[PDB]
Symmetry: T
Subunit: 152 residues, 12 copies
Amino acid sequence: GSHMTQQIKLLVLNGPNLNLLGQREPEVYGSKTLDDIIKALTDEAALQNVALSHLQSNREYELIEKIHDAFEKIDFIIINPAAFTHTSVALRDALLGVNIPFIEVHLSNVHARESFRHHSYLSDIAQGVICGLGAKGYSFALQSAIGKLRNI
Amino acid sequence: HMTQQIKLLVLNGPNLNLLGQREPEVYGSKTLDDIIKALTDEAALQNVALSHLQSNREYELIEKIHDAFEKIDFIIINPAAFTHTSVALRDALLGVNIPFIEVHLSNVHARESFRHHSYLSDIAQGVICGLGAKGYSFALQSAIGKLRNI
Amino acid sequence: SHMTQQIKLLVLNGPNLNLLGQREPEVYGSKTLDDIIKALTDEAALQNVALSHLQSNREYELIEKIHDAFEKIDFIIINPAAFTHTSVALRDALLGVNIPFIEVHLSNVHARESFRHHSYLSDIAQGVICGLGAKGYSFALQSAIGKLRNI
Amino acid sequence: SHMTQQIKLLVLNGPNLNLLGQREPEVYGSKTLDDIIKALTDEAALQNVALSHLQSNREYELIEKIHDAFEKIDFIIINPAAFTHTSVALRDALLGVNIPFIEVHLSNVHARESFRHHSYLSDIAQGVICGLGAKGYSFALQSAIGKLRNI
Amino acid sequence: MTQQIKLLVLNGPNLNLLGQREPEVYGSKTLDDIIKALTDEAALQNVALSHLQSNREYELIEKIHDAFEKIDFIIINPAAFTHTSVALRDALLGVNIPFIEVHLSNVHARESFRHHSYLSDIAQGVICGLGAKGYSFALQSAIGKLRNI
Amino acid sequence: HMTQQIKLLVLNGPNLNLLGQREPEVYGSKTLDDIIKALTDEAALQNVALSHLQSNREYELIEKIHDAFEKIDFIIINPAAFTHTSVALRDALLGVNIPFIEVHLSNVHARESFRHHSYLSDIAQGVICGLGAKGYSFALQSAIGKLRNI
Amino acid sequence: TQQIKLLVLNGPNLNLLGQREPEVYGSKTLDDIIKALTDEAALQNVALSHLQSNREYELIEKIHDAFEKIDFIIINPAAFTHTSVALRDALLGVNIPFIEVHLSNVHARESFRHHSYLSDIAQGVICGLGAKGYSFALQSAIGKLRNI
Amino acid sequence: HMTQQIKLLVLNGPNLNLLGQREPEVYGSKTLDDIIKALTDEAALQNVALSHLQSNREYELIEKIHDAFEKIDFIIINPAAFTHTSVALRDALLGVNIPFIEVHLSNVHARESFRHHSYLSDIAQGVICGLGAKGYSFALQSAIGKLRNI
Amino acid sequence: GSHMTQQIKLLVLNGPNLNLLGQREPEVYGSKTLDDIIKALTDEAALQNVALSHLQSNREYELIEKIHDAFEKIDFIIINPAAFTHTSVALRDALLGVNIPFIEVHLSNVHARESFRHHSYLSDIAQGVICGLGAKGYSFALQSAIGKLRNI
Amino acid sequence: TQQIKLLVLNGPNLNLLGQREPEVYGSKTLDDIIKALTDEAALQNVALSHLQSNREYELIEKIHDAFEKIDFIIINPAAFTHTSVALRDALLGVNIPFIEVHLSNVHARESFRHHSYLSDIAQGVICGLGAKGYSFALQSAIGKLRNI
Amino acid sequence: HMTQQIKLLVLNGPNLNLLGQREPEVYGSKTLDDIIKALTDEAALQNVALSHLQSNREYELIEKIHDAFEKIDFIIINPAAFTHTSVALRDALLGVNIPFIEVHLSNVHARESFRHHSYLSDIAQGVICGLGAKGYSFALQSAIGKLRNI
Amino acid sequence: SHMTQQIKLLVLNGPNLNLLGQREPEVYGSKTLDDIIKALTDEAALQNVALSHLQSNREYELIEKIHDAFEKIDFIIINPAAFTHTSVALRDALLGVNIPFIEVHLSNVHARESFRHHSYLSDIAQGVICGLGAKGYSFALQSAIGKLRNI
């Protein structure tokens, strides 16, 4: 490593049911696992002097407690809250409480689904939102975080 | 390999011609011409021929979409204010059956409640907002992956 | 018993209707808007109706054509397409020139998304036809003739 | 001779339409429902359409006539009058027999009270005609012929 | 001397049950008792009162059609059809006879769906919650509206 | 054979003092004073002592209801515009627990949609609207029957 | 052991069950369902009566006639579920406990079908379980009346 | 006569552990353990192996549904309060593609308006409410008929 | 020190119908009058060098005019607007116009009653709101005012 | 005179009190508030127990465990005020009276914060009065239980 | 003067007596008395006799409107908070049938959503908001033009 | 005491306002928009205001004229007519050039259909005038002068 940049510490958070990625009818719904996505993203981040940490959980409390633990340690969050996007005021208040900028990512286009999925407790306080672009959305959020923090 | 050339059209709606003009020290210095020149160069390196129209005239955007029929493989559109108001743009994109991604420089969800409604988001392949000029580059990268299966 | 007075009728078509007959003709149909308007103009001519037509993707062209109709045109048939749901300016142009009109849609607007159930013209139209394809323009013409000649 | 296949068409009229032509004929109009249906039956006969008709104030009579149309009728023209806004039972009868239909209203429902802007039939109709008076039934007949003969 | 008024009273579904269930708790007066007393009150003022109660929407619609050019005024308690029947509204609009809407119970004190009437905006007026006497008040109102008294 | 005397209070809200004043040939000639004089005489024949207040002052109506506690048997109220706006009048009538009938001269359901809401109708014994001045007489007759069980 | 009298009421269009494209939409008729249900009821000393009608008034008048004769009602009001306050008021007026049954899942259909004028006053509601829903309602009624 | 064994999972949401505890003489005496013991015995007589989880922890219900994938034939679920709030449970049941019936002991339509909405009812095979504990037995009988075509 | 000892002037405002407290069916609804509550509260305030003034009125104008008269004289307001909570924009604009901090108090739990009572034209601009704790709510508002003004 | 057992429950994110920009947003931690409140309660023969959690299940299970042990609950559900029907049903299920407390004025924030699944079944609600709100709820509970 | 004299009534609602009092260096120094003195002088130059009432008492505004009947040609009203709440004021102005203009110092559309509703705007000849004290002068000029056909 | 700095003010008029003075002049009035703007330009000139004007039925011409006003125009008076209710693009043009504006309507928008009660400009306007006819432009001019010169 010969990095001239200040290191960024970035946390990726994944919400409920995303552990199932790649393991129902892979020929129909797609083959990539969450582990595959995060391994590729961690490698992409490391080339740009970004240290990437990750948690996926079906437990709302684990996501809230990981956000609390990020206070004064993490520079940026990428979050795919999955179903909790629509329901969790507690996650909104955790992110407001630690004051870390974040990007919201969804694999699927939330606006093309049921009307209840059009509402997010996070989108109005996110720096931005990516939906419908599949796993590449995490890479775009990483690229955006680097640009937003380094002013590039 | 050698890849098949992709023809991609970028459409920008009203007021985006003002980019880089107002309080440049506060709101930013990049013009739309700067963004599109850089995006055109990025596309050319990946065998994508990128065409562009920005207009304050809804009819110019509709007619450009009509002209894309059987010629263009993918659209990137930032409809700006027309996102919230133009059923005619929705029906133009449905009429020519070209896949598209919707891009906004600013986070539409962080602004007035009327900006939370889009006539395009439910038929878009995807939507990017709040990531500034880089959002066009992300949409380009997404389109290439969607068309080449990469 | 007497020869009829000529009716001057204007047909206005809104955005995207220029695409009729182009996309997947084997699936969605082969008739172009030019084919529809040629047939309609011939039907009108046999009943002493002089039929004029404009299709445009430019809202201003439709507004200006309505302004130009003042004291010249007896009746309007309008398919505003997407502008049905969005254009107060077209409503106000039609109110401003005081010409009776019928609203026509090729497709059934009530069978589509909920935003298409609202029209800024339907409450001030003499009536509305939807879902009957190109024949809807012929029905509007027949209605206009009956409304003006009391037949 | 007729070289066409005969079409069997049923016209259904809902409540209060029996009053047509009765109240202040000099003000509101003189044509009765019987006059409208006699003229429509003659028009249909010229195009090898056999037209049957029921008007009723009884929701059950309309439902049972729809049930009886199964595998006998090719097309329905219905003016449900007030039942347009209230009858899920009529919607489910028409869904149950799977015969295509056109909805007709004499008056422009969009120009009246807001409760009249909702129909339990318009989203499943082939199309809807409103505000064109008695001629709306003729237009629906012409549409049915075109839809069934692909003309 | 007065000119005779012809008045029709229409009663909607379920009002035939009045006086039947737990009479010691919910009340003992039948609809037949109410209409006999109202007919006698009408007769004293040279009003010929006719009546139909039905559970059949079509019987009410057809009775309204039959009233055209025969009946001067209608008193109607549409019961549940108040909230649901556009057909009854259109029957009364179609024959153009003035009417008063009557409810025995206070419709505003019950479920929210009962707050909406398809008749109240075109009625001459509305009485609710005053029990059987509401029909007598509607009769007195009709006589005043027609005789200017 | 004497009845027990009933004490009944009639309350009239704002603007009802204008009755009979504007275009009498078009809108009608009877004043509120005419209506209340006739109603007081009707009540007196049935051993009802009828008291009356009309006011444009919400506080005068509220204070008159407070003063009715343990003195008045029944209230007839036409709150006029306050029907739609005054929770304070609802809470005064709930506070003194005297039964009341709500009366309107005009049909409130035939006017603007905001007039369809009453802060009193759900707690009234009943409601009369659209029957003109006779509505107060009907409310009086109902009160007498409700109190005397006739 | 003490006989129960139970009335099953079926609303409009349910006479079409089993008629249209039987290979696609199913073969069982309403008559088949009611014959089987009547036999199931008879084994438990329940006398089961039935009316299906497209006529709202026939359903209302059958409920009126049930007063002081019928112990329990099973009702599938079909389209009238969403529209008939008169049926609600008939069932409130005769004070007989009832269960609401739908063959299809009303919550999986158009949003107007999510509203019932009966569900809040029913003892309970069954939907989406096909013809077996009437048998479950019968078993529930027997348990509710015999305290079993 | 031979049947293939069915594996059925019953899921119970929050607060249902309280059943039978408060004022048994007033609210009823049966515990959730009593209901599940009886239901497990009923299932065993029809060659159904019935497994059960009740939890106040949303994650335990989600993880149990994930674990059911390719192992369980049918789910009976009473999500209790989570019926009205949990999109995550809806998405778990969509993700594992096992047919399910929704059961409530009480009539949800007779209670507050917020209880009228379910995140599960539109994707359930069917819904039973208001029939008390017997609703689980009806859901079991329905599941057997739906899987064995009887 | 001295800042802890300076006299506070506090105004209590009570809206319509609160003059009825203690009058109707005292065995059922309770016996305490508004005069009883205000006498006890005035004595509680006097022990902490708080001069407590009171107006109850059924007249909206009297409450508005009392608020106007409070300008530059009164340090804090405790208000129970009763029915006016739900209806009076004029009271909101009087309190905004004189810029005196206030607490909103209700004896009964407004959230347990009709849905129209769930809206207040004052709650969003109040320092805070107390409901459902009966007459003690006025004492809590007094204690809060003293803490807010004396920084204790 | 008879000892009262009172439980204080605090919902998610309240562990952050006093941490972020203490010079701007305030310095008092939840531990400071609860230590002072426990001492206040002890002077009046109230045994005060406390749980703060980010875990909805821990709050629900603590309410279940309060049945027939606890006389009164003071709860600040924080974000769960607006979302948790499960907490409402736990408190209804154990039938212990409670007061709802918020440090901040919920009515001064976003419109979604104006709705509480607890306020209509609480004995009362305090908001916007900072840490003193817990002390007022304690004073109210003592008065309500001792008839003082 | 060659013109017919116009009699105009200016009505000001609650809290407008506070104009000029709080933080004059920040919010402005002009009192309502200053505004009305200047407006009265402007009116007198055009043969307009101006009467004025400001009140925090709804009844005083209602009674002043009643007293205007057949005496006043035009009303200018700033109802302040009563714009949003008073049906009684609407019904007073309908009852006396004098044309009026509604004036607000501040832009009501830029404030809370409850201020976007007026019980007077739909029956006013016109509305002025956000132009400060000059709005009363514009309403006076409009009234003169509307009555004199100039 | 000091001579005033010249103000540059732009007046923008939306669709259909070109019809002013044309339809039923005996009923709706005889004044044309050209008459109104000539009088307003003269009024402005006496107070050292240079007044420029555009009326258009073309939304793009209004947007482009707003863009051209950047760093040249001190204040805008706009009557967007039907575009008041529909054009987010005009809102974003005015926000993008940061010029203060007043919204004017000849008619009382609050006395018409309920859709006219919503404006995409009123919340960001310095103020709004409606229902005062052509004099509303003069009042907006007087307000702009006071707002810019602190008079």
